[PDB]
Amino acid sequence: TIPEYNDGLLVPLAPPIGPFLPGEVLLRFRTYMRQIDTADAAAEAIDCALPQEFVSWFASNAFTVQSEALLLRYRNTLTGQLLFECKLYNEGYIALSYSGSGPLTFPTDGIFEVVSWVPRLYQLASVGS
Amino acid sequence: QDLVPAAVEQAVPIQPVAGAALAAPAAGQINQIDPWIFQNFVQCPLGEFSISPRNTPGEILFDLALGPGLNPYLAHLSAMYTGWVGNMEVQLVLAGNAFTAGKVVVALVPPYFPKGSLTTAQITCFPHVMCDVRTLEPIQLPLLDVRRVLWHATQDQEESMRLVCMLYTPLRTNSPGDESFVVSGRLLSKPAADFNFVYLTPPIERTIYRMVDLPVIQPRLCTHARWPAPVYGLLVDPSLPSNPQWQNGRVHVDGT
Amino acid sequence: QDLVPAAVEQAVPIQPVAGAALAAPAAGQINQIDPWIFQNFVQCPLGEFSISPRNTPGEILFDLALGPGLNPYLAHLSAMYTGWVGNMEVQLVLAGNAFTAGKVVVALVPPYFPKGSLTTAQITCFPHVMCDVRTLEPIQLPLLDVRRVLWHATQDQEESMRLVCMLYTPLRTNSPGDESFVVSGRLLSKPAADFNFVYLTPPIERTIYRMVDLPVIQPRLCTHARWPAPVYGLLVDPSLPSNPQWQNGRVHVDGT
Amino acid sequence: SGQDLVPAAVEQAVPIQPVAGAALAAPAAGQINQIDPWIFQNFVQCPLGEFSISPRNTPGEILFDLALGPGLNPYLAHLSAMYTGWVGNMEVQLVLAGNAFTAGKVVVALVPPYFPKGSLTTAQITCFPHVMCDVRTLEPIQLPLLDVRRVLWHATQDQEESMRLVCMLYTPLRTNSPGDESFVVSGRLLSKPAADFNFVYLTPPIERTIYRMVDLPVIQPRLCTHARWPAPVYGLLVDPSLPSNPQWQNGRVHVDGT
Amino acid sequence: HVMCDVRTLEPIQLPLLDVRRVLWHATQDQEESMRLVCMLYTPLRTNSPGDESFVVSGRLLSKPAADFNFVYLTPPIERTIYRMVDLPVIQPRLCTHARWPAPVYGLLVDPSLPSNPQWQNGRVHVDGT
């Protein structure tokens, strides 16, 4: 959650991630930190909208926008099995159309390949778990 | 007599605009392009849309803009030149069943039209082409070059003749119909007979109009943007709150 | 005025290449073929493919190569000759319902294009023909003879103008739809007006380009390849491990 | 404007015949492909077109060596992502406009295709069609770069055996200057396509190719991180009082990615 | 471009054409017109006695061509935007200090003080801010 930037006051900061179309969830990245613990052994995870080397490659090349979102394609580079296609909005978060109920994980050995610019009202194929 | 015909085709009429006839004595050069770029419909970089049955009538499916950013050949040549003048020629395909009842209408909205919100009654007052989603052959349009200035610089803040496409009648299925059907659509375009660029510069990028390439980095060989640790997982949990307000790791796709 | 038409047909434009006009003073002979081989579309030996709904967009459905191996008449005549020069003319049919929404695009990839992996945005930059799977009449293409050399020998390691066909939009069914639907497709081809062979040799086989014939032996009158015993059974058990690493009985279909 | 230089060093005769460019490959390509007629008007600088002759160079040092292709122009190296194929010749200038106190000569030969590379000693670089020119020439030395080939065109994939253009340093560079300075003549190399250059067959413009010279990220070194320790960079500096040729293992990449 | 050598005698005339998108520019608006950019192509190779170090100076003189025209006669306005910054004709002894309400008693230099102060009074941009 947001910490205290002022000691007790308010401060301008980045707006929340959104909005999404009905039926789209936020694609999260995941690393595990060092938490001092007493008895819990579950690894505390911290999620970003985009990892590093995606905050470089932007502002090192400053692209245009030309629409509203990018149609990515996370094709697993081994044998070319298409895992999922996801929308990257211009505010810098990846939205993947999922209709399930629990956490579906993904293999971390594929290359994001761009396809095209889409409008905001684009509908993706769902994922299966 | 005189027979009238009820089925009479189609084909929106145009009056030809001037290309390099107006801009000739004010541009330093007028550069012709390859005469085989005028022959092939290639796909626009903004050439994807989808029509779901959860779209209401009046929804705008795409909004292009007449530029050299409607062609991968003309977005590559436009690094070398500083300005363009001329007309394109769009064409859209539609992958629909014979179970899908609906119709889209593709209008030619002029520049400096007040960009509020159009309705279905007002989209059909422009030069339009009516097309259903059941059709097989691709339908095409002229996308002319109505302009106040003599030529357009390739820094797109100047207004040009947009191409709006709305949903006229609702996309309803005669079958029971899954909501995950969506009718795909692609947009292909080519120059019409009067396209040319203006003034030879060195090729630079940056730009605009270069396509966004992503770094070829597998996410196991990456770094998290809120901790000095490599990335490990890749998940989507819908039980989490869907609007996080993080501060680190946020960026635009234009570098800001 | 000027009417434009939205529906305008089709028909990829070509510039005619030289056949036996370039290769005439460097070949010893120029042998004409039967003038009724130019009249009939006969099926290619690589003329089968299928589009399942489990195919993702971007998948390549076939990849031919312009040769005399695209015709059963020209793969029979090519035993007698040592080289060929000229253009073919493909045509593909598609057996689809009116329940299948999808589109394939058949491009003409030139020789010495870097054979990595194409995408959907790049397949439509070639001279292509867009065709859906719901169509009835067969659509055809010119398959020209872009080449660096004067003629092609009939030993296919020299590059020639391939013909790639991708899946543009995904093959989705408006119905609920069984996954075992697959849209069949066949490829038929004939010579265009400027085909001729080069130099008369004796007919030999071997080759290439003779079709693989199997021995007319019922498997009860055969011999097992890991024991000196005749074959008895013929089964398919999915409970066994599906990747055996045997050493006896393994062979290629090219003799190695 | 002194005329104690050599202004009589015009584009000399070379023992070569005229070579047909796009007239051969016109009926073997599948389409009509012309390029912009303002590309042929001005000499722009080659991408590998900058060299220098210090007086610490022996005779027989190869100054530049560049094959004929689309890589001799910033325009044609940009247009050759759209095409697969080229034909025809180029026209190359040479800006050797050194001081009025230097002395020395270079020799620019025309090495044919399928000539074995590697050594190319100074004794045998005169056996080709060559142009000899002083390093004090005022006007730019022009020379043609013909397209000798046995195939009807070349693919735009750089393994094509094509006509090179080697420039050996013939006699060493020296100055008769009255004190303490030895000038380094800094040459350039300008080029434009000839009247019948032509590309062959249109193709999707792929960036990840050949030529498509190296680009760098626009980020200050005070923002970048360090490749031998997890820390930022705190100022670059030279020092000739350190281990001069170290043998590190971290942060050592090639410029072909490996 | 023109690649002029640095030891030419006669001056290098060259045109500066008016490439434009509009029919005529407006004098009270700094709109984009054709620039001249001069780049040092090959470096200077000279001697120098011991001082000075032989700079090569270069000036740029201009005049209108045969088809320069103005458009529409208006009354002359004073502000402009083509005005040399005219300073007040006032000696510094009759001025007033910025920080403290006193007259000025002498202008000087001193290296030994903090060379880059951060005063918050007496700070004004030349453009009037």
PDB file of N, CA and C in Angstrom, chain E residues 91-128:
ATOM      1  N   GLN E  91      23.429  55.035 -14.553  1.00  0.00           N
ATOM      2  CA  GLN E  91      24.667  54.595 -13.941  1.00  0.00           C
ATOM      3  C   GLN E  91      24.366  53.761 -12.700  1.00  0.00           C
ATOM      4  N   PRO E  92      25.199  52.754 -12.408  1.00  0.00           N
ATOM      5  CA  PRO E  92      24.918  51.860 -11.273  1.00  0.00           C
ATOM      6  C   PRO E  92      24.978  52.520  -9.906  1.00  0.00           C
ATOM      7  N   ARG E  93      25.560  53.714  -9.786  1.00  0.00           N
ATOM      8  CA  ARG E  93      25.568  54.395  -8.498  1.00  0.00           C
ATOM      9  C   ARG E  93      24.191  54.924  -8.128  1.00  0.00           C
ATOM     10  N   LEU E  94      23.350  55.212  -9.118  1.00  0.00           N
ATOM     11  CA  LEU E  94      22.007  55.711  -8.867  1.00  0.00           C
ATOM     12  C   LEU E  94      20.965  54.606  -8.857  1.00  0.00           C
ATOM     13  N   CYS E  95      21.376  53.359  -8.675  1.00  0.00           N
ATOM     14  CA  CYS E  95      20.452  52.239  -8.698  1.00  0.00           C
ATOM     15  C   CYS E  95      19.939  51.959  -7.288  1.00  0.00           C
ATOM     16  N   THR E  96      19.295  50.811  -7.113  1.00  0.00           N
ATOM     17  CA  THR E  96      18.895  50.325  -5.803  1.00  0.00           C
ATOM     18  C   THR E  96      19.177  48.836  -5.742  1.00  0.00           C
ATOM     19  N   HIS E  97      19.577  48.360  -4.570  1.00  0.00           N
ATOM     20  CA  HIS E  97      19.936  46.961  -4.435  1.00  0.00           C
ATOM     21  C   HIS E  97      18.693  46.083  -4.450  1.00  0.00           C
ATOM     22  N   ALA E  98      18.904  44.810  -4.769  1.00  0.00           N
ATOM     23  CA  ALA E  98      17.805  43.868  -4.914  1.00  0.00           C
ATOM     24  C   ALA E  98      17.427  43.218  -3.593  1.00  0.00           C
ATOM     25  N   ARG E  99      18.416  42.723  -2.851  1.00  0.00           N
ATOM     26  CA  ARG E  99      18.136  41.983  -1.626  1.00  0.00           C
ATOM     27  C   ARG E  99      17.666  42.911  -0.514  1.00  0.00           C
ATOM     28  N   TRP E 100      18.487  43.885  -0.163  1.00  0.00           N
ATOM     29  CA  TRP E 100      18.271  44.803   0.936  1.00  0.00           C
ATOM     30  C   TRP E 100      17.988  46.206   0.418  1.00  0.00           C
ATOM     31  N   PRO E 101      16.991  46.906   0.974  1.00  0.00           N
ATOM     32  CA  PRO E 101      16.601  48.213   0.423  1.00  0.00           C
ATOM     33  C   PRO E 101      17.615  49.321   0.670  1.00  0.00           C
ATOM     34  N   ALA E 102      18.699  49.299  -0.089  1.00  0.00           N
ATOM     35  CA  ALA E 102      19.792  50.251   0.012  1.00  0.00           C
ATOM     36  C   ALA E 102      20.265  50.582  -1.392  1.00  0.00           C
ATOM     37  N   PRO E 103      20.960  51.700  -1.570  1.00  0.00           N
ATOM     38  CA  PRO E 103      21.626  51.951  -2.848  1.00  0.00           C
ATOM     39  C   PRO E 103      22.799  51.008  -3.067  1.00  0.00           C
ATOM     40  N   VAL E 104      23.245  50.970  -4.302  1.00  0.00           N
ATOM     41  CA  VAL E 104      24.393  50.173  -4.707  1.00  0.00           C
ATOM     42  C   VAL E 104      25.648  50.999  -4.487  1.00  0.00           C
ATOM     43  N   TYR E 105      26.705  50.366  -3.980  1.00  0.00           N
ATOM     44  CA  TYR E 105      27.927  51.077  -3.632  1.00  0.00           C
ATOM     45  C   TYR E 105      29.163  50.532  -4.327  1.00  0.00           C
ATOM     46  N   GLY E 106      29.006  49.692  -5.342  1.00  0.00           N
ATOM     47  CA  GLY E 106      30.163  49.250  -6.091  1.00  0.00           C
ATOM     48  C   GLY E 106      30.038  47.862  -6.674  1.00  0.00           C
ATOM     49  N   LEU E 107      30.428  47.713  -7.933  1.00  0.00           N
ATOM     50  CA  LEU E 107      30.404  46.435  -8.621  1.00  0.00           C
ATOM     51  C   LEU E 107      31.826  45.932  -8.798  1.00  0.00           C
ATOM     52  N   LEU E 108      32.004  44.621  -8.670  1.00  0.00           N
ATOM     53  CA  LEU E 108      33.332  44.025  -8.642  1.00  0.00           C
ATOM     54  C   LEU E 108      33.233  42.550  -8.999  1.00  0.00           C
ATOM     55  N   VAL E 109      34.370  41.869  -8.905  1.00  0.00           N
ATOM     56  CA  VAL E 109      34.446  40.422  -9.008  1.00  0.00           C
ATOM     57  C   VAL E 109      35.140  39.902  -7.756  1.00  0.00           C
ATOM     58  N   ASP E 110      34.856  38.641  -7.414  1.00  0.00           N
ATOM     59  CA  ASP E 110      35.568  37.949  -6.343  1.00  0.00           C
ATOM     60  C   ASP E 110      35.488  36.439  -6.517  1.00  0.00           C
ATOM     61  N   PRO E 111      36.602  35.765  -6.807  1.00  0.00           N
ATOM     62  CA  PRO E 111      36.557  34.299  -6.919  1.00  0.00           C
ATOM     63  C   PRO E 111      36.408  33.577  -5.587  1.00  0.00           C
ATOM     64  N   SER E 112      36.852  34.174  -4.478  1.00  0.00           N
ATOM     65  CA  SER E 112      36.949  33.450  -3.214  1.00  0.00           C
ATOM     66  C   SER E 112      35.597  33.190  -2.562  1.00  0.00           C
ATOM     67  N   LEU E 113      34.550  33.891  -2.972  1.00  0.00           N
ATOM     68  CA  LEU E 113      33.219  33.675  -2.422  1.00  0.00           C
ATOM     69  C   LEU E 113      32.612  32.410  -3.023  1.00  0.00           C
ATOM     70  N   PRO E 114      31.464  31.922  -2.474  1.00  0.00           N
ATOM     71  CA  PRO E 114      30.699  30.874  -3.172  1.00  0.00           C
ATOM     72  C   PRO E 114      30.326  31.251  -4.595  1.00  0.00           C
ATOM     73  N   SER E 115      30.889  30.512  -5.555  1.00  0.00           N
ATOM     74  CA  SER E 115      30.827  30.907  -6.956  1.00  0.00           C
ATOM     75  C   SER E 115      29.427  30.773  -7.532  1.00  0.00           C
ATOM     76  N   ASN E 116      28.627  29.840  -7.019  1.00  0.00           N
ATOM     77  CA  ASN E 116      27.275  29.597  -7.512  1.00  0.00           C
ATOM     78  C   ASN E 116      26.301  29.716  -6.348  1.00  0.00           C
ATOM     79  N   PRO E 117      25.880  30.925  -6.009  1.00  0.00           N
ATOM     80  CA  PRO E 117      24.916  31.108  -4.925  1.00  0.00           C
ATOM     81  C   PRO E 117      23.516  30.721  -5.382  1.00  0.00           C
ATOM     82  N   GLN E 118      22.581  30.786  -4.448  1.00  0.00           N
ATOM     83  CA  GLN E 118      21.193  30.426  -4.697  1.00  0.00           C
ATOM     84  C   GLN E 118      20.266  31.472  -4.103  1.00  0.00           C
ATOM     85  N   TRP E 119      20.544  32.734  -4.428  1.00  0.00           N
ATOM     86  CA  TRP E 119      19.719  33.851  -3.996  1.00  0.00           C
ATOM     87  C   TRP E 119      18.306  33.729  -4.545  1.00  0.00           C
ATOM     88  N   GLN E 120      17.341  34.199  -3.766  1.00  0.00           N
ATOM     89  CA  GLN E 120      15.943  34.140  -4.158  1.00  0.00           C
ATOM     90  C   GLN E 120      15.361  35.514  -4.435  1.00  0.00           C
ATOM     91  N   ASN E 121      16.185  36.553  -4.415  1.00  0.00           N
ATOM     92  CA  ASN E 121      15.761  37.902  -4.748  1.00  0.00           C
ATOM     93  C   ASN E 121      16.741  38.490  -5.748  1.00  0.00           C
ATOM     94  N   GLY E 122      16.225  39.290  -6.672  1.00  0.00           N
ATOM     95  CA  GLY E 122      17.037  39.750  -7.774  1.00  0.00           C
ATOM     96  C   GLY E 122      17.178  38.754  -8.896  1.00  0.00           C
ATOM     97  N   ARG E 123      16.345  37.722  -8.923  1.00  0.00           N
ATOM     98  CA  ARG E 123      16.349  36.730  -9.985  1.00  0.00           C
ATOM     99  C   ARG E 123      15.237  37.080 -10.961  1.00  0.00           C
ATOM    100  N   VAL E 124      15.602  37.324 -12.214  1.00  0.00           N
ATOM    101  CA  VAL E 124      14.624  37.652 -13.244  1.00  0.00           C
ATOM    102  C   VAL E 124      15.155  37.151 -14.579  1.00  0.00           C
ATOM    103  N   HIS E 125      14.275  36.535 -15.358  1.00  0.00           N
ATOM    104  CA  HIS E 125      14.631  36.160 -16.713  1.00  0.00           C
ATOM    105  C   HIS E 125      14.613  37.384 -17.613  1.00  0.00           C
ATOM    106  N   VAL E 126      15.425  37.333 -18.668  1.00  0.00           N
ATOM    107  CA  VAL E 126      15.495  38.441 -19.613  1.00  0.00           C
ATOM    108  C   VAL E 126      14.187  38.570 -20.383  1.00  0.00           C
ATOM    109  N   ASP E 127      13.477  37.467 -20.587  1.00  0.00           N
ATOM    110  CA  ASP E 127      12.186  37.498 -21.261  1.00  0.00           C
ATOM    111  C   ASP E 127      11.049  38.014 -20.385  1.00  0.00           C
ATOM    112  N   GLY E 128      11.324  38.482 -19.173  1.00  0.00           N
ATOM    113  CA  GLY E 128      10.322  39.148 -18.372  1.00  0.00           C
ATOM    114  C   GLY E 128       9.678  38.320 -17.288  1.00  0.00           C
TER     115      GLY E 128
END
